Amino acid sequence: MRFGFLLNEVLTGFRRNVTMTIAMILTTAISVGLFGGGMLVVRLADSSRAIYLDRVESQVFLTEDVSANDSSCDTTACKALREKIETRSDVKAVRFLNRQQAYDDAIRKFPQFKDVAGKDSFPASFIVKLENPEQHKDFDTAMKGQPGVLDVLNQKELIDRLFAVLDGLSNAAFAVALVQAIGAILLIANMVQVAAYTRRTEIGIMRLVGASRWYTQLPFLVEAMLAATMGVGIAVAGLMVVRALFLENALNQFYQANLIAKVDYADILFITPWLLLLGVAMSGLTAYLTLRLYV
Amino acid sequence: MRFGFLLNEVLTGFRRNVTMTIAMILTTAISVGLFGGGMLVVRLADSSRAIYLDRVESQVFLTEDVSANDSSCDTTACKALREKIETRSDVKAVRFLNRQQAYDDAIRKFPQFKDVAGKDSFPASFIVKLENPEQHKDFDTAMKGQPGVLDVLNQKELIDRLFAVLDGLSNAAFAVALVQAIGAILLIANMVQVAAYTRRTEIGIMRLVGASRWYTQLPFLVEAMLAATMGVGIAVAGLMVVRALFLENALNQFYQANLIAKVDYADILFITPWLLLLGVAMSGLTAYLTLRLYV
Amino acid sequence: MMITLDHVTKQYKSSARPALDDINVKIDKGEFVFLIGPSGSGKSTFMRLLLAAETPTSGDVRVSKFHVNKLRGRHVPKLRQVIGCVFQDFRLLQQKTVYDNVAFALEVIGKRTDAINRVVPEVLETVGLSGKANRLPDELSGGEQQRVAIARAFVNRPLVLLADEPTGNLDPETSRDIMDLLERINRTGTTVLMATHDHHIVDSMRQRVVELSLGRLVRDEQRGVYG
Amino acid sequence: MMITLDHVTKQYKSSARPALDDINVKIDKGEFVFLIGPSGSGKSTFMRLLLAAETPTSGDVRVSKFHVNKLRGRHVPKLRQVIGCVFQDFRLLQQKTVYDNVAFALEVIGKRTDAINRVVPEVLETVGLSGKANRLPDELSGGEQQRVAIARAFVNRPLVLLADEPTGNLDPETSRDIMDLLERINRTGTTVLMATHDHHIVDSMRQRVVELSLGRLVRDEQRGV
Amino acid sequence: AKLNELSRQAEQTTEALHSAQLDLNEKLAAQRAADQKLADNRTALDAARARLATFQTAVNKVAAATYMGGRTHGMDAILTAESPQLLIDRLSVQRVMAHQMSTQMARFKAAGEQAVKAEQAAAKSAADARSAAEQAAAVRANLQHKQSQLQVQIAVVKSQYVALTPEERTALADPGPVPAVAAIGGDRTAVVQAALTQVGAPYAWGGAAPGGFDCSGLVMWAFQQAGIALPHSSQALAHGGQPVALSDLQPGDVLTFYSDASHAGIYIGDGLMVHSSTYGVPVRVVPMDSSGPIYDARRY
């Protein structure tokens, strides 16, 4: 197969263009690194979604004329609506709440706004737990204007707009990763225009000896193939050393509060086969086509 | 001689390499854009630091019956309260803030009360700094329930936690910016190599007939200066478009949150003289010595 | 059939004259035939025409085994393997020694690796090209670079061993020495195409000398002279 | 002041014959000297010792101005304006015309164009190119590409015209049209050198002949063929 | 004989005083309207100021409440929280506190805009009141002018009066040949039922006294026996009523007499015209061909 000749002919190529062999690996590693640095952000977003989705409670207010008069629902007008929508399909428990306890519970939560909010601003309500919080659209459409309900707060969906702030930065990181990739892919085409100049004396005689079209480009291709190997390795090494130096003062603070996903080093190597194949992807076919379209 | 002759040759060097010399611009643009972004977030953090308290403070308050009258600490209650708390070894010093100076700092910390917000609305505070702000919650509860203290306020212990993540983001931006900068050097070094390779004839032509050395590098440096100006221009346009595209939607709500300071385009224009300095002198330096040890 | 090309005019336009008149020629297999052509008229394009690089735009070119105009991806290197070419430049490889310079054209064509050692003493130390073959070619003299250049062209006894200006920059005092090496291949009866414009150099042998003016063949004498 | 060269034993990497053994030649105004020998004589290093392309390890070099064995690099191109050397590639820009090449051959020093163009057509048609200077050099035939470098070699004052292989691989009949072109400027009075290896041109005008075989001046007589 | 220009200038300023009093009636009505609207606009402005002060205290206390760490945006609650159970409760109370604060601020802004609009309306009301007071002063100025020239012509009329006469004019004894018969229409029968008081009645200046009469005094003193009331201004009696024609001859109408409506006598008919005579001279009955211009006539 003539493997030892290909083993030692590549060393002269590294000895020739010594001022670009580092730069190509640096630019490919930088281009693949922040592209890899977004899927774990999406991963921690969806994982931190689940730790809050498990405990969303439905809450629906009532009209004032059925709440300002009585705290406990003992009238039949509120009781008929109470006993009709509370056990249909997507229920486990329904908790009724009074009005006076619904005033000072905010005071027990914090001793602020104690003077600026009146007593007559807190309508009576219910607390309902649902089996599947994803299927919220059923009771959104099962609740219209009924004699006793004033408005529906649509459970607690204030979490999606809370976590929506990081989608913009993930999109920005993906966009600047894309522009770094479009500024990095053409260097692979530049390699073949600088490397063939370094070995003009042999490619001419190797053309006229009768060499194969399928085998004339392998010494121009295997080095570009192996260039993508250590580039993603130093990219994930840099990801290790940026995770272990600048995020321990931030992510560890939410650990004892139990509010985040708490990702680690294990799932980072899980996505490595999805990125190393992408790293060796554009290095191959672009280098194949640029020699066919120039040499 | 004059610039009337040399305007042709810059077009020829760009025309002979329409593919390699366009990689020149944007890889420098990323390197200066990350460094421009790091200065921006550092300046924003130092601007928004002034809103909150320092690392050793306990914002306490007073009741209205001793604050609207006797603005100086002259009454029997103020003198007793300003002597009882210093007896034990828990605090360092007590300050003096009353309703004369409780208005001007409030509009400073809340720049939306330029309307008739009234006078004699903010209670006297007399804020206290202490030695150890780690086991101080018992002190806050002890001052709670005192006959004359309304409430306390403490803004530490995962309240000033955003300053543990903004510096980390800036340091991460610096860490990738320095690697992108050192990757840029070993690509801009090949400018003169490919230029000498593609134009080997005339650079020998004035060599044997006798020409000044100082005029030989002049048709090579101006390309790097023009590419540097193009890179810094597309970089400062890049911040303009990336903020107004979707970063405004994640920052507009922060002003109603009043957690950060006010930022506009003029702040970004303030740092642009510092961004234009880098890029055109470092490139000139690294394009200077690469020819002294070449020809 | 046999080695014969006729009606070959690529018709190079964007010029005052294409100098390609589709000349029909008939040359056998044997001794040395000299192409004493004027400069810039019919040397480089004619040499490239049988080199299977620029296809003719009229007619076709035939060799005794293959077809030049009709080809595929695999038909080209089989024609390319059976022709040896000698050029003006020495075109050595400075990063390697001399003993494997002639072997460099053997692992790239698909030969048995240990069998090269059964061929390299038969090829390298054949006729006056022994030397030592273990020196750097940079410090070697210029009078033996062309000796290994023609050794690279003759490694498996190919059919055509065409040469273009073997002397070139060499002094005439040693051109008769390398001619003596050139005629050794001519004694073997292999086909050689020797094209140069050197008056009173190859006129001593008085072999088949041909010449052209502007793409039209004007000399065809089998024992002519140059003038 | 009748400046010549002597000694110079430049061994460098491998000594063998270090440059030359000794040099005992003289210059003249209007001289024309051949040189004949094999390829191993190191004649390429002889001319490189003349334009200060090679520093002599012994002796000195001096061409009519100063001893150039010790001179600053700023003063190295100070004396190069009167020296013309000719080659085989002819140094031709395919993207520039003939008049563009002649203009570029003098534009590099920096002068007002009011006196540059006043002497261009006086030497354009002198060599034999009467007009057609706005033509691409590939469109120009091969019989006059060697004349363009000659034409741009006299844009300054001719003092020394160095020549190493001016004809190359060329037909002998079309070398006769240029062997008189340097003879015409030799009648002007400037000196001119010559470096070939064929013997057919030796017995033609019977000028000064020097031989060299591995740094050794084997025979030189400055007379006859 | 010659005591005619004095009588005409005496009745002219009398009717001018009557028209000035008529303008004074709507003048006092206009300043009464200004006074009652000035009572209303200030009360409305006071109520607007009271509710504006109430909402100013309301925004004062909610401006104060944020100073004691009233963080009410909602995303900042993740810094305060330490359990997921606390965080959802904090956002749930946050959604109603921010809503109530927004409604308070919007109510204050709308009420302040309405108070500013009501203050602009009160400013325009003050401009209207000042303009009305100035206009009332202006129409009091000509009123006091007529009061000033009141007694001047009274002195001129009393300078001649019954005096400056011989006994020959006293020997000219003439109570009046024949008074009218009136509308015997039918609502004006009592006009000439008391005509024995006329034919011998002396003249008075602008008086409807039983014995002292003027041009319009005879008219209203007769018409109050019929029960019909007309303004005591004989120049405006030519402007009150429908224009009766010259062709139809029915009694009980009025008639302009002595040129340019200086005597609006009642319709007499029968080729005679019972007009008011001078002071002391009894009310004569001379035909319509005594003065000259007669102009139109109205219906009482």
Side-chain angles (χ1 to χ4, degrees), chain E residues 194-195 197-268:
Chain E
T197 60
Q198 280 76 12
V199 190
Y203 166 80
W205 298 270
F213 300 101
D214 53 303
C215 68
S216 171
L218 291 175
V219 173
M220 325 182 298
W221 183 66
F223 284 158
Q224 70 189 10
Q225 324 294 335
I228 49 171
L230 311 179
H232 189 64
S233 52
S234 65
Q235 53 181 0
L237 295 182
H239 302 75
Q242 55 96 9
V244 74
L246 195 56
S247 63
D248 50 347
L249 303 184
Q250 61 277 353
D253 296 333
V254 304
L255 183 64
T256 58
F257 195 67
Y258 206 85
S259 77
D260 47 328
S262 67
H263 176 262
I266 45 178
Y267 183 83
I268 313 295

Side-chain angles (χ1 to χ4, degrees), chain A residues 202-216, chain C residues 73 75-77 79-84 104-110:
Chain A
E202 51 92 23
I203 181 61
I205 53 181
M206 193 280 257
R207 270 286 292 272
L208 56 90
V209 71
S212 175
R213 181 188 61 90
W214 203 18
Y215 289 83
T216 176
Chain C
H75 293 62
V76 175
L79 176 59
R80 195 71 65 176
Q81 280 166 356
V82 302
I83 305 166
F104 185 78
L106 277 296
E107 86 282 353
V108 301
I109 57 179

Side-chain angles (χ1 to χ4, degrees), chain B residues 140-143 145-196 198-199 201-275:
Chain B
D140 308 333
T141 56
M143 295 298 102
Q146 200 276 335
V149 178
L150 282 184
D151 51 329
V152 303
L153 175 61
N154 179 215
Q155 292 179 355
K156 319 168 196 311
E157 287 80 41
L158 303 186
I159 292 302
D160 51 356
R161 209 204 298 108
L162 73 165
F163 294 100
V165 75
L166 293 183
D167 48 350
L169 195 144
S170 66
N171 290 13
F174 292 151
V176 292
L178 301 203
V179 184
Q180 180 66 28
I182 197 66
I185 308 298
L186 280 72
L187 188 153
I188 66 189
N190 311 91
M191 271 314 327
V192 297
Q193 292 285 338
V194 71
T198 193
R199 286 194 297 264
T201 58
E202 72 280 21
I203 63 170
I205 283 167
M206 62 303 297
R207 189 171 188 176
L208 73 165
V209 307
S212 66
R213 193 261 309 264
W214 203 82
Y215 285 170
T216 53
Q217 86 282 353
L218 295 188
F220 297 93
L221 305 187
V222 291
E223 283 82 7
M225 319 304 98
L226 183 62
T229 59
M230 261 285 178
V232 69
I234 196 60
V236 299
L239 277 296
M240 295 298 103
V241 293
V242 69
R243 178 184 176 186
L245 189 58
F246 48 85
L247 292 178
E248 188 73 27
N249 307 330
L251 294 175
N252 63 7
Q253 43 83 29
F254 278 146
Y255 306 104
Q256 284 87 16
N258 57 91
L259 305 186
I260 68 170
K262 312 302 177 181
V263 54
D264 65 326
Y265 292 152
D267 311 331
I268 321 177
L269 298 179
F270 290 154
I271 206 66
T272 45
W274 308 93
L275 276 296

